[PDB]
Design a protein around this nucleic acid. Sequence first.
RNA 1: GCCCGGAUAGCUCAGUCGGUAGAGCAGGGGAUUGAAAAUCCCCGUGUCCUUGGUUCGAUUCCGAGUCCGGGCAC
Length: 306
Amino acid sequence: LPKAIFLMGPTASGKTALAIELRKILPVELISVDSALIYKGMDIGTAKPNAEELLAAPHRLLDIRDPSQAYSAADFRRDALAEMADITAAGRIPLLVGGTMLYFKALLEGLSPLPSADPEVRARIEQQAAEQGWESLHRQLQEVDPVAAARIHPNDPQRLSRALEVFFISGKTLTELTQTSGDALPYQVHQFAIAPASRELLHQRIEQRFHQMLASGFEAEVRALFARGDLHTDLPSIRCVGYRQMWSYLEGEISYDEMVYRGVCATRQLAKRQITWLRGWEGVHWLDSEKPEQARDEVLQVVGAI
RNA sequence: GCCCGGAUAGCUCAGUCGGUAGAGCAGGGGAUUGAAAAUCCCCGUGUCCUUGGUUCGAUUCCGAGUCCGGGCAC
Ligand SMILES: CC(C)=CCSP(=O)(O)OP(=O)(O)O
Ligand SMILES: [Mg+2]
Ligand SMILES: [Mg+2]
Ligand SMILES: [Mg+2]
Ligand SMILES: [Mg+2]
Ligand SMILES: [Mg+2]
Ligand SMILES: [Mg+2]
Ligand SMILES: [Mg+2]
Ligand SMILES: [Mg+2]
């Protein structure tokens, strides 16, 4: 029953700022919960904390992967669980910060044990999609696993592929394996979420931030990655907001102004979904991004003196 | 100044053989089990620029005006 804290929220909501200020009055250790902040070489477009901030409040799970190697909610849970052990062992409290809700979820509720990605069976699945389309595959999932087929739309290639893969590797069906639940988070968690008071203020912060990045050398950053010649748009790292658009720009597929428009929109759409996650998330205490930055107090009281 | 194209949803544009119109994108909402900053599902009434003409009826054809891209001329 050790204690732990979750500081969630959408992009540009001031989560990072709040976390280090918290480090000041609480015996907490910061753990990053961000699918993009894991990449080495992706610092400005991901809004990664700078070296000074990191000096004040160290973050675990940052720069732990090369943009060419995919991560997963499963890998995060493992790494996260291990980092928490180490932290609580030191008599301090784990403060998980980020905007990647699926990771928070996988960590909190666990994950049904399932086979990991198998590049070979995926390549085959992709192959059959090009020849017969994803419909042929969805009709096949329909035969072996109807429960999953009803949930997964025939237009959802990632989930469709995933449901077939599990079956092709184990022979066991996805709905059958998911009947076994994953290990819940053996911690007492206090979940907070911070966001601006209105959707429009969020949009302004998003657009403004995107320009601060361009002005901080974002383009050059993405070019360094473009120059490696080994990264492609089917990699989680390149599909990240901002990066994907900038990649289209370096490929000469779109103009600069077009890239800036799409990156901003892409970031707003991301925020929209993040808010969808938080809405209905159980046990969430809401805090305000805007000036009520002194929301640390609401944290101080909910978690109480430790 | 003259000629040729545009002018229709927040933006880019389709369309209406004359019977008041629809895609994409933007935006909104919802899903979410080893790619998740990903992948996918649902939501489209707008003085069809203005004004005359013809017409039962015009955003739609014709005339003129206005604004916007070009071209010719100085
Ligand atoms: C989505 C983009 C472009 C950057 C990541 S932003 P973030 O989640 O770090 O936002 P805050 O930490 O809340 O400022
Ligand atoms: Mg941050
Ligand atoms: Mg227009
Ligand atoms: Mg037209
Ligand atoms: Mg008709
Ligand atoms: Mg309509
Ligand atoms: Mg949209
Ligand atoms: Mg008329
Ligand atoms: Mg007319």
